[PDB]
Symmetry: D3
Subunit: 157 residues, 6 copies
Amino acid sequence: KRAIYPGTFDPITNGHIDIVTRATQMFDHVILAIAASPSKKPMFTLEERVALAQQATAHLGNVEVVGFSDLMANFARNQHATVLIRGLRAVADFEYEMQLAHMNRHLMPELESVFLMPSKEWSFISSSLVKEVARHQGDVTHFLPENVHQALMAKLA
Amino acid sequence: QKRAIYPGTFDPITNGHIDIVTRATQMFDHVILAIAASPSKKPMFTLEERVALAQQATAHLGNVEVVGFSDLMANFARNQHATVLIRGLRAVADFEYEMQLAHMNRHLMPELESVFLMPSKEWSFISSSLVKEVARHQGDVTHFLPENVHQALMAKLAVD
Amino acid sequence: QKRAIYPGTFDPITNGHIDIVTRATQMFDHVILAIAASPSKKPMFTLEERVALAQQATAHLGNVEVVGFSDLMANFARNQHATVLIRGLRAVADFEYEMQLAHMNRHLMPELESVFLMPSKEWSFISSSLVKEVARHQGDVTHFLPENVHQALMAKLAVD
Amino acid sequence: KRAIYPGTFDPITNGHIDIVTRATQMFDHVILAIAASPSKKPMFTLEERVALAQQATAHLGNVEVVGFSDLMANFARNQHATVLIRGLRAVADFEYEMQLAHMNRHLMPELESVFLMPSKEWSFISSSLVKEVARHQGDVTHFLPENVHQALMAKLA
Amino acid sequence: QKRAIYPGTFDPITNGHIDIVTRATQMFDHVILAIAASPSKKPMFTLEERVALAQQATAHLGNVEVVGFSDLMANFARNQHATVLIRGLRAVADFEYEMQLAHMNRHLMPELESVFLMPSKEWSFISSSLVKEVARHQGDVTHFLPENVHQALMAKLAVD
Amino acid sequence: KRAIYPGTFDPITNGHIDIVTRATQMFDHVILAIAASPSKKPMFTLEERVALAQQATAHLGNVEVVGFSDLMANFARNQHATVLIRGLRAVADFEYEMQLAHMNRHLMPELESVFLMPSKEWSFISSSLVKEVARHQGDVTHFLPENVHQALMAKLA
Ligand SMILES: CC(C)(CO)[C@@H](O)C(=O)NCCc1nc2cccc(O)c2[nH]1
Ligand SMILES: CC(C)(CO)[C@@H](O)C(=O)NCCc1nc2cccc(O)c2[nH]1
Ligand SMILES: CC(C)(CO)[C@@H](O)C(=O)NCCc1nc2cccc(O)c2[nH]1
Ligand SMILES: CC(C)(CO)[C@@H](O)C(=O)NCCc1nc2cccc(O)c2[nH]1
Ligand SMILES: CC(C)(CO)[C@@H](O)C(=O)NCCc1nc2cccc(O)c2[nH]1
Ligand SMILES: CC(C)(CO)[C@@H](O)C(=O)NCCc1nc2cccc(O)c2[nH]1
């Protein structure tokens, strides 16, 4: 059973690590898929985001990190994935996630979009929030893998 | 060989529940559709009627087991060797209570992973409660139920 | 010649309900303020007291008819030749349940269009339930009710 | 009775067609009013959006499509409209819609802002979502009138 | 010399409530942890048991007074010369009802300012209701309660 | 007891005046702190926003208006503030406010983030909404202090 965990992962946080770890305990193979997302004007290039996530998930045997600029439904079909995973955080996320799930169902009916719930520890964080704290030199070591913390600082310094 | 549990009161089982359990069978090897006694909710159908209705309505799905339970859902999940807990999500109200429940279940049984599925747009605005209220007030709910459930509900309301 | 229905339990009718039904009369030719028996909710005022209070409180609005009903709201709407169903919306909780209700009503009577109105900011945080709870616990709710309702509620609580 | 159905309509979708059709069954005359919305940096010019909506609603006898750059309350007063219609989709929309409705009530007390609920079929779509799928070459034929689908493809190709 | 009131049913007091009242003592000179009789909710513990549990669980906090009340919360707040009303906020459901309550309380006692505090992430998904339901169904709730409350709840369920 | 009321205040509205007035009835000293917020591309410069808020709160004896570009938690510590105040308006605000409060608690555990509820009168307004009405020449005199209304008009004219 192949699951895809998609997102912008700009950068990947401990909240994303928690969801992908839960996904590997549930499915045989997990693809952590990083969308190019040029409309979101990401801080890190797609190549940087893939390298950060590869380094951050290296300890997990059944995670494959890949980047994509394709339609999500086409990339899932092309990865032979039948499960799409998203972490369920806040109401704004949940409602937007419902819209994407219904759109993906229209494009690929056999692709099941499911939600996992993060640990209470990571329930109030996001890449956007971690970047905002880091832009003001605030300590974000607790929220990110070591390699990501170094990269965020290098990008801002 | 993942075992998933899909718990609820299923009073009665609706097309919304059938949609969720069907999606679960496409994802997991074995799905237990677990029916909670739920006495504090004062159910319309007894546990045995609820189990027989769910069995008939899921008989075409080869990897579904319908079972009744009166214990803490997490105690039953543990005894059934389930590592996945299926929850259907339709809207905002579902989400907030579902988050409390999922954290509590994680505290009780950390090895049990809550996974949230979405029903078809067709069943995204229905609940057993609304179906029961409409049928009690002489409204047509045939569209929302499996045939056997429609028959059972008409018979229940004819004498109540 | 559009006929609109504004249903509810109106237990009792508040300034929030008066605000909504007033806005409806400015939009539609005829408005039926339809009062549901609602026995499962165990109302404070009987249907007849609820109808008489609403009649007195809306007497100044020439195109409002106050009527009691015990049937499925959509069955009553159909029999009254109503093609518009008025719902008052104050916040998020209202919205989610209102969406389920509106889809169910559309299934039951497709020709009945649900239209959601917003009350004045003044009444956007009140409900009959909160007004009743406050008055039962000796709080001042005069501001939220029509004069006749304030008088009726004081008399009800004096003997209960 | 004159109703106004305002929005950015960038582009008009089947969700908008559903709401405007419901509005014509309720009110004698419906004005579908397209706001210039330069702050939203729309994909289509105001002239393009008006032509798309005119073509898409031509089959509805009592719809008039117009563009405007004015304050909503002033445009409604100037159209002799006493009802403003918005489709009720998600929580984020509902809360923002409450703010606009209360602001419009302060500016024009006789203008009643009301909500209609779209069909379940269009309950999870938006112009933004349809544009995102289309930017990735995904099939959006189901969500748009034929002329709009052709225009979206021409604009992106 | 600000006096704050922290009202609730506290049936029973949880670590979530302890967290909120602890934060309140760091902000205000005197905090009244006010326990509502709340008969319409049918509480598990009597008012006297609820007060004794809260007193023992807050004994280490020098500026907390635990007091029972049966009146309208705003009437009690006024009589206690409280000008601050503490509410704990965990999620969306809390927020909407809390806004209605806060506006009603402001209408009743304008000089009483509602202030909303957030509990630790640790207690952000628990409620007395969920703790009671879990314990009644033989689940482990030790983590969510003060030691004396855990002891009292085990004794209550052993005989009920 | 020192409380900080932070925000972008671009510009300060009657909704902000209501919250800061409530804060002065609760705490001995209130710092109304204006974040530079360059990522939000504010309409008014930080210097303009501070002058507008100083003039608007001059009648309140225990309010001090200050601007800052620092991390919120560091600015609060440096102001000897132990209470952070935010006004509770809508769900989207509440959920974002929870995220900031939990982040601020990680950075400064003794800083208590609390919420005050605005008057029903200001429950549906925001700086963004007032600016949108003003950009379309709509009457915003009711929502703003006199000096702010003059400044908004001067900036737009
Ligand atoms: C990364 C993401 C999961 C964050 O939410 C989402 O932005 C996304 O999937 N980007 C890829 C392009 C795309 N956008 C789509 C929208 C609806 C259906 C699709 O298949 C889509 N593909
Ligand atoms: C019917 C239901 C699946 C729908 O929500 C849920 O109410 C439930 O689980 N009922 C069984 C008793 C129980 N109540 C619990 C509360 C928290 C954690 C548990 O494991 C629980 N078990
Ligand atoms: C009082 C009320 C207007 C406020 O919500 C609503 O509860 C209602 O309609 N009560 C009548 C019985 C009924 N229950 C129904 C449920 C769905 C569709 C119907 O037509 C219904 N009629
Ligand atoms: C298109 C729209 C309905 C989408 O929501 C909204 O952006 C809008 O109305 N744009 C026109 C200018 C305006 N913006 C206003 C804000 C509040 C009150 C008014 O009268 C406004 N007029
Ligand atoms: C327990 C509680 C603190 C949690 O919410 C709340 O239910 C309450 O306050 N109970 C006392 C009676 C009352 N009910 C009221 C309703 C509105 C305004 C009041 O002052 C009220 N007092
Ligand atoms: C103005 C504001 C209160 C509006 O919400 C917020 O944008 C803010 O605080 N800006 C300053 C920089 C900062 N951003 C942070 C995010 C999390 C924790 C911090 O200490 C932060 N400091």
